[model samples]
Target: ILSKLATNESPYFDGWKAYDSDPFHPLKNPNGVIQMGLAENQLCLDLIEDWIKRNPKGSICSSFKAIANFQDYHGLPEFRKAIAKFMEKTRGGRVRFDPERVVMAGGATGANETIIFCLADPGDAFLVPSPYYPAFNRDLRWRTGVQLIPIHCESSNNFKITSKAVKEAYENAQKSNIKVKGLILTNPSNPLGTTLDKDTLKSVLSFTNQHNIHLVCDEIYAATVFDTPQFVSIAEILDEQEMTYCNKDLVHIVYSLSKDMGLPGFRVGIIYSFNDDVVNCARKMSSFGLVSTQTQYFLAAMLSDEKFVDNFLRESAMRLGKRHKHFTNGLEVVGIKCLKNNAGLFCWMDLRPLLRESTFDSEMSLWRVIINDVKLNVSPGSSFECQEPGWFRVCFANMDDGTVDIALARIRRFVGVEK
Candidate 1:
């Protein structure tokens, strides 16, 4: 079981290796491969740096001890309350989260695994939409001995997921004698960067409840949505209280501060379950990887300041939307198209026009040229389990304006495109 999950040969992981082996730097390695495959939020680090300067009490402090030494599986009550507040604000304050139900783990990775351990046994399965996050296999299945069955989607309608796909995957699992314990949905999707339509979300919820299975919404990129058709959270929908076909206990959300806050080093992951038993189970299981009090203290003080949070979110959205437009605009000038996206730190770039043949082999061939020849580390769609070839996820927010220009220039020369 462990060996099955240990593989990291996918381009999603390999891209990082490519970058590290010969990373680009303006002064150091001017001609080296630039990293466009990392989904990191480097666009607004200045804002955080400024925040840290303004709030010294919350940031760099030797706060009177005791709490640092006194760690509990329940986690810091202050942090739970603060993060719940942050979560609600990120979703536009349409729904509220209970601090009582906020279960903390080392990271979103650990939190997700904990949920599977609590809700699924070995041999059970969870249905995920195609073109999902790459490391999900290791996070959701490794230790629990569970499995993920992709609900294949097509690009004809922009890879839109529907109840038909969900039902089909579930029914197929049934026919194969594999008990599907849940459905995992990544809204403001990892690779595609689009939110699930509300109606589609409702249909999937009804399907989950009808089948008596869990629905885990991974909203790690919740704050990345920058345009119309605002993000809809499972918590927000459940609050409507009119979806009679859905069972409240079947809904769960796995969130992390890694992407939105640009703080992966903190390792703050949250399990917000609507089900009471799952919450209790997750909280107890959190013992293996509870968050540090010092980190909690920093975020608690930082996130609870309503004024700072309000300003930070507003400015963050503005910067992200601008960066997204800038990158896509550059791609358009070079005659490259991307899936229409409103959120997240990356773009689902369509490179089919550059493919020698419309096949995965052709995709990899193009990928190798980009990495080895063009010196850009963009992730291939195959790594994300995308059913189609010629799609790549190119991240733009992880670099500065100068780096963005460098990447675009390289792409332009590669395509022989400049207007």
Candidate 2:
């Protein structure tokens, strides 16, 4: 009854089955089109269980206990030591990481809100590029009463926000002396899945640093990268001198374990920043306390186990690559021209012509068409702040082969692709 392609989740097609296939269906990974929705192994979850058994009330006990305790506590000595060691292996020389610079957050969204509350004041402006995640705007207005100024992402440049765009915004602000506060970037973005390379990141960072604008990177989709591109954090390129106290302290990175670790319910995430002042303020403002105690202990344990995570990431990359190919092929057959989405689990495609330009002329109408007429649900471009009229996102993960086939067939039928 649920054509549940609305969210980019790995299909529940492969259910818990018998190990040695007896009377059940084939004991194989759901083979058909490739999907990028789910991570291959239960990397985070399996490690959580292993840790609790092996290390209970030991050297790291108080550390996990502090993690379990409310945020008002003095410090997390044990968890801090554990994460410091883990960062050495995980970051692999990306940058110097200090436990003092990190804070455990509920998830990426929580991390973002914390950043906004910690930095921007009322009437301050948060700048975002168009075709960007709408949640950024909602977060700012609802939480802090900050005005959002949207810059456009040129579809001509693969929908990227160039340095020129940033500079122009800064200049315009200076001309009228607009009170700009922060800038948000979703690297390996939500809808586009465009991975910002080191060069692009540097350009954006340099601009933000100059304009005294706080830069926030929501890197929840970092692990879902399809291309082997080098990832850059804003802290790497900019120096403290180029920034004022407010802007210098505002550079922050938010990471979510939901998508890559396959642990959405765990509500585990981290916020990294060079400024302790910002981290402290955020922790104080957010009275949510610490996340679930069990989750933190499990994460600490999982961090100790490296081999499991490596194997999990490798297998997941392979599975996602296969699924992406399948989805792309399906679109081609259906006459839906879509660019190859290089990172996340969804593809954005233009469908203006097919809706036939009627009075029911809205992205929601087309969304209804895809969900009801085609029986295939997808996110509308408008949902993510895509201003243009013809775009829709198709999810390939966590979907059955039959559903994909039917969806593509219906697309072809509706579009009237020539035989």
Candidate 3:
């Protein structure tokens, strides 16, 4: 009876469980422990708090009397419209999103799972580039019985995805009798923290078009691009007719306020589909995990403040750029290398030189020393399904300046660097 739950226990969550139970909760164990594993932007709390202060009784947050009485599967119309406008602005106005295509879910987690439910059958599968967000294993598969076939991207080419690689993955899946249903793309990628170039984007669109399968773009990090080669959305491609042969019905996007807006706790998830059928189906599924009316009311007002949003975005990008430089430069000074990326909250750090042996077992052994001895908890690349060994994802934006300094010091000491 309980077999399913027992069998599906997530390895990704298991990695965190060891630290979470005895978590060095900053206030309680500040000196001994630091969590650099989780991907979150704790850098702009002050800015967000100030915004909240500026909008009190007159704003939707404090004026929550009406929110208690409002709840719907379709979400608040004003909130949907606000999200559409915000998305357009976030992507630099190259594409316009329609409010009618917007559907809310619990968070990006829920939105992804919802899409999997709508797109794939029990034995169907999706192709994802390797070194992906670790949660996709449980998110895309666990309850829905879907599968993720990793398209082995390597560090030799900055882990770039090419049409040849896509074809190899698709053909391999076909040989294995796996029904490849779609491709899961994370632009402004998580561990790599790199944005895809336009040529790669065009290639991906063309490949999906040729295959007649779906393309699910996860652009939760759209507003988190801290540097160059700017972000390009599937909406922008569709609008510009970049791939006229591509069926609009096969295109969909999963987005969230978690990373971009620095509001993971708000639980606002969006699924935008070019296909009307998917829009209707996902909207119906939204009943299970719709955004709370209170949160929607608050965000609808907050997002509609274009002046505040524009300023916040500009400032946020500047701050993220500074933090990224600070963290990556510190690592470089200590003789550790990173993948030279300019987006997302973390960087793909190469610790291969430090590994005793070139093996995943060696990777885990080093991971143990970093966690138990150094007391800094960064995610091992193995957990992210990376084919390579000795890489780790170290999140820099989740902690304050002083905490970051402390973590870096611990890392330097472990790496045998002299003060």
**In lDDT terms, which candidate is top?**
1
Per residue, candidate 3 scores C-alpha lDDT tens digits across 1-419 of 56876875554454466567556656787655578888898777787788888888425546456677777777888999999999999899778888978999989999999999999999999999998998898889998899888898888998999888889999999998999989989988977899888878888988898888999999999998899888988887876655766799899999999997789998999999998999999999999999998788888888888988898778899989999999888888788889988789998999999888999989998888777777777899899899989899988888778888888888888777522
lDDT of 2 by residue, 232-297 (tens): 445454533433333556578777677666677767666776677887776664456355655555
Query: What would the TM-scores of all predictions be?
Result: 0.95, 0.76, 0.94
- Tell me the lDDT of model 3 at 90: 89
The local lDDT score (0 to 100) that residue 276 gets in candidate 3 is 93
Off by over 4 Å in 1: 1-14, 59-63, 417-419
Candidate 2 vs candidate 3: the lDDT winner is 3
User: Runs in model 2 with CA error above 4 Å?
Assistant: 1-93, 171-177, 235-250, 352-362, 400-406, 410-413, 416-419
Q: Each candidate: what lDDT?
A: 0.87, 0.61, 0.86
The best candidate in terms of TM-score: 1
Lowest lDDT sum, 10 consecutive residues, model 1, at 2-11
- Could you tell me how far off, in angstroms, the CA of residue 76 lies in candidate 1 after the best superposition? 1.5
> How many clashing residue pairs appear in each of the predictions shown?
0, 5, 0
Predicted structure 3, TM vs. truth: 0.94
Angstrom error of the Cα, residue 98, model 1: value is 1.2
lDDT of 1 by residue, 1-419 (tens): 34544664333466678779999999899998898988899777787888778777884353546566767877878889999999999999988888889998878889789988987999999999999998898898878989999998988989988778878888988899999999989997989999888888888888888889999999999998888789999887787757854777889999999998899899999999988999999998988888888888889998988988898888888989998899899989978999999999999999987888999999998898888888999989999899989999999888888989999989989898422
